[PDB]
Write a protein that binds this DNA or RNA. Sequence first.
DNA 1: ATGCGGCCGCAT
DNA 2: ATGCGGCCGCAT
Lengths: 138, 139, 87, 89, 196, 203
Amino acid sequence: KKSKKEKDKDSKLEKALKAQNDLIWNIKDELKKVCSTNDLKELLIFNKQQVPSGESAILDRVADGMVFGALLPCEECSGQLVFKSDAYYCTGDVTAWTKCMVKTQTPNRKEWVTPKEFREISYLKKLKVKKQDRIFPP
Amino acid sequence: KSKKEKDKDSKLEKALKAQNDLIWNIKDELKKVCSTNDLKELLIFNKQQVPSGESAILDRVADGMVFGALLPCEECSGQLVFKSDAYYCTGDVTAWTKCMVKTQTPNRKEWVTPKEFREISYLKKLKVKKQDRIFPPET
Amino acid sequence: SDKLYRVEYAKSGRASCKKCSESIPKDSLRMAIMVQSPMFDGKVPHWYHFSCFWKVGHSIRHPDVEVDGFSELRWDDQQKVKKTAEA
Amino acid sequence: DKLYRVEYAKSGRASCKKCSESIPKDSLRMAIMVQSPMFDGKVPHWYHFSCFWKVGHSIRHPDVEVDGFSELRWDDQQKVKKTAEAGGV
Amino acid sequence: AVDPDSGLEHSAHVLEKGGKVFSATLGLVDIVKGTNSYYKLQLLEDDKENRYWIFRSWGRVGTVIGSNKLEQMPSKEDAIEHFMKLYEEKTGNAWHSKNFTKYPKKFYPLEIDLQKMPLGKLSKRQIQAAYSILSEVQQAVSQGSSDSQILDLSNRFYTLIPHDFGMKKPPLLNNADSVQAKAEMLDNLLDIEVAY
Amino acid sequence: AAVDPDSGLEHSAHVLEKGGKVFSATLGLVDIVKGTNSYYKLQLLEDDKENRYWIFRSWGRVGTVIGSNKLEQMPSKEDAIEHFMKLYEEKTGNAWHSKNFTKYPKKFYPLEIDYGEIDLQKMPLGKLSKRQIQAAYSILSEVQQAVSQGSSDSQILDLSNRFYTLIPHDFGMKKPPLLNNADSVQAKAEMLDNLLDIEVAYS
DNA sequence: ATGCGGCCGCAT
DNA sequence: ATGCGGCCGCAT
Ligand SMILES: [Zn+2]
Ligand SMILES: [Zn+2]
Ligand SMILES: [Zn+2]
Ligand SMILES: [Zn+2]
């Protein structure tokens, strides 16, 4: 069997996973605190991102864009990609009859740009942008 | 009723009608090719505050487009709005009193139509023009 | 500081005329007169169909300054108002 | 796609299916997707995180069998993964 | 025809303002998710002549899953306002639209006028369009590429021609024998229509 | 405290009080540019012999016939308090038991009434606590110094609004006058000294 | 799909 | 000020 070096890598990966999760949740709660819903809609609009339906989804997409960058438009349909537990699914319309089925784990994205209005809250994030990309489950 | 005075008067009223029906064509085209949320996106993109009321929303959008995105207030940092005769400030200089700023030549950057509505931006035929707001010359 | 007469395209068809008491249609031309509200501190508009407004005995000399939102209307509508002001 | 959903109540209006008592907002709740006899589409039957296990459903690997599992808070993910084994308390 | 689920098939009749008759039927299909929904909308007027009803019906095609609502409209005319509102809210097109544009995520109107056709007869226009779509599907299967195009054409066809697939995800039209079977089915429909 | 007579339950009920706070607040809001000058009474009354609960709202123009009221019989013994707090925070922007009476823009401001011929007329909304009168005297000090400075009429407008809020006046349907004149400041300071003497008279 | 309650602009 | 109808997210 093997459960000494392999198991070590597994534990390290799960540790990084927990790190990313509780990081994004700290960010979400801080946004819940220092901002209102309309401010988050402003944020999303500033980064060329579509505005979803639902407060939860709004701040989720804001945190996503902030930590990993503003998701660029789709490759073919020019729609908008959204995280979905396991990967980024496209939510565009390749035609008036069918949904676009694009799906990736390394979408194209520019670096997020916090407007200067919330600089007072941007320092509340302590920057800490990090070059970390989205970590997905095994 | 002098002829020089009268010719200039007729010329000015002609330009006034031109500006009015221009802005109204723009407002109707926006009513057509866009929804309310798209106009809110537009206003937010130009650092402009989002008003309460569909009519006011598209009015402010047309204003910003034709003459430029109104900059923040000079003292209170609020938002200016057209009001028939001039631009009135709607900010709050304090928690007790309204700001009373009022001008006809506010500070403004050039409007910036997002590329999403480029399909509708060409529907405006550009035609931005260096025209500033024309006010009534009554008093 | 404010005017005495307002004019605008109905921001909704829920409002009802004050003379004929029939509902005003949305996006139609309507004229109102501001009056003190006996229920709270603030002025409120009494609305009228553009046709009924003149039968209540009010007459306006120079609409371009006596009425609020006159410059915001469409041009031919501004001229219709300026014409009906006379007679 | 999945058969089980889990999330923090997006509103306290929803009511549990076992105890029939209203679910509180921003609380952990688990649902099972079922065909809606009134229209073409699946709909979630919701449950208090405590009631969900008393209806006879058991999950082996929540990390793939349940939807939105990765979106929860970490300690909540571990609470779910623990209750999956055995049940309830 | 008055829908029987309203119960007013005897006590009332279907309305018609001008050339348009207030009795539309829309369908919406999406194979990736399995969606396959029907929507009947009728505006019924009493034989007496002045009670008015707005009848909505919706559900899964050729299945027990569905429901309906019969709303007695008080006004003789506001019923038409409600009818047009619902039509444009469900299909994205006006009631008297010169063109039946397809809007994304929204329904599509079917031209109507026992079991092989779950929603009733079909006009020769829809069947001609379906035959042309089958032509394109056959040529694209000969090309043997772009399965997304096959998905698009399959959705369009299953929308124009309803099928009773029960609770099962509709099958893609990548197979050639399937295209031949559906073309024979459309020829049968054409013969049945010319028989009338 | 005191039950407002426009509710008609001054006999059949009494004013409620949970702890140190008494559910009987009075807010005012003034804006000289527009002429606004509004009062708002909010009371939560409990039946003097039972468990019936009433939410009494009253509003209008200060010392004028213009206004109205609503008496809503709250069914629950406690949800009445929820409604009271909701209305308070919706009208003034502050919580009910706020340690600090912050002023929020466009919203009302709470007045401190002295719960427990001059008072009948000169004070349109009732007695005033010595704290409010002290603050008004300091604001008059600032107004006098700013009139001596003779600049910034917007500051004069701000101080005038603050003063007319803390000290209600029966201006009828007329726009309240600005406090740019020095004789006006002296008259209002004499008025406040009269109020202070009337308050110290009560022992 | 619709039902329904919270919300907000427009009347009064 | 509140009343009320249109609107939209969340339940079912
Ligand atoms: Zn796509
Ligand atoms: Zn200002
Ligand atoms: Zn009328
Ligand atoms: Zn339960």
